[model samples]
Target: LQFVLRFGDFEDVISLSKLNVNGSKTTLYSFENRYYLYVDFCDMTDEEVENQLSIMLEYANESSISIHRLEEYGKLIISEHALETIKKHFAS
Candidate 1:
């Protein structure tokens, strides 16, 4: 399952450092002056995925944005390990 989140600011993206997601790939992009984080729950359990989605929603809006939309309209900022890199780069 793939879930996308739209953030109004970079600080909100850094807030995702609290997410303890695993067994998935996350992509980061910028579009129309907003930030989008695409979380692909490739191996997470159903319940776990729900929990993580809820946590993410605390800092961002759930987006139905597709990969194609992002590829063509958005600027790819991080193709992989997005959350991990964000946490490290802006660790509080």
Candidate 2:
């Protein structure tokens, strides 16, 4: 399953990426100057998904927007390896 989160700050994005998660295919998009993180958790176990989402809740607002809509209208900023890329770029 897929869920999207809206981020207003790049620092928050870097913060979330610093925390680890597993088995998700992540994407980042920019729409109207807002950042969106798309997470596909179908490969993750239930507990994994739950834990990841809870961590994300602290930094982003859960979005109701469709991923397809984001793909169509938003600029793709990062794809597939979003979390790893973010963490690497802004490593602590």
Candidate 3:
């Protein structure tokens, strides 16, 4: 399922405890722009947000391969719960 996160709700502001449609509480942080966001950004910033969110979303496409690892001499190098997060524009 696809779900987007924002700050406020109808009569209440969403909290870390709030549950999303997928029954998950994954609120890391929240920020709103205009009279409200940033790392000193707007055009350039939003441009990044565009690519940033795009890159983030690109991973969402591959739901499989939740665990990844690299090994050298039969030793685990890195473990992450991500799908092809390191290489961009590449398939998992």
Candidate 4:
């Protein structure tokens, strides 16, 4: 699978690295507070991707982490508010 990570600003890079995802390969890029998470599947079908994304959503929800999925592009966009929450959580 392939993935792309886009950040609105360079500072956001610090926060992106803090997200806890196992076996996820991400590539970071800059565009314009907007960041992009792109994942490419090699052998996996659409159902597999949906299932994986569902699991991710479950994890985020269980941990009180806010995340939104862009189904059209199969992108996962993490809100800046969520990033702040994560930062604060890890700081302590």
Error of 3 at 31 (Å): 23
lDDT of 4 by residue, 1-92 (tens): 44443444434444444543322443322233454544344456667666655544432321111223333333333433444343455423
Q: 1-92, model 2: which lDDT tens digit per residue?
A: 78899998888888889987523788999887788999888677788788789888898999988888899999998899898899898859
Q: How many backbone clashes does candidate 3 have?
A: 0
List ranges where model 3 is wrong by over 4 Å: 1-44, 61-92
Q: Which stretches of candidate 2 lie over 4 Å from their true place?
A: none
Summarize candidate 1's per-residue lDDT along 17-47 as a digit string, tens digits.
Answer: 6455522688899999999998888888889
Candidate 4 — which residues are off by over 4 angstroms?
1-25, 45-47, 55-92
**Total clashing residue pairs per candidate?**
0, 0, 0, 2
Query: What C-alpha lDDT values do all the predictions have?
Result: 0.82, 0.85, 0.24, 0.40
Residue pairs with colliding backbones in model 1 are none
C-alpha positional error of residue 39 in candidate 4 after TM-score superposition, expressed in Å: 1.1
How do all the candidates rank in terms of TM-score, highest first? 2, 1, 4, 3
Q: Against the true structure, whose lDDT is highest?
A: 2
Residue 78 lDDT, candidate 1, scale 0-100: 86
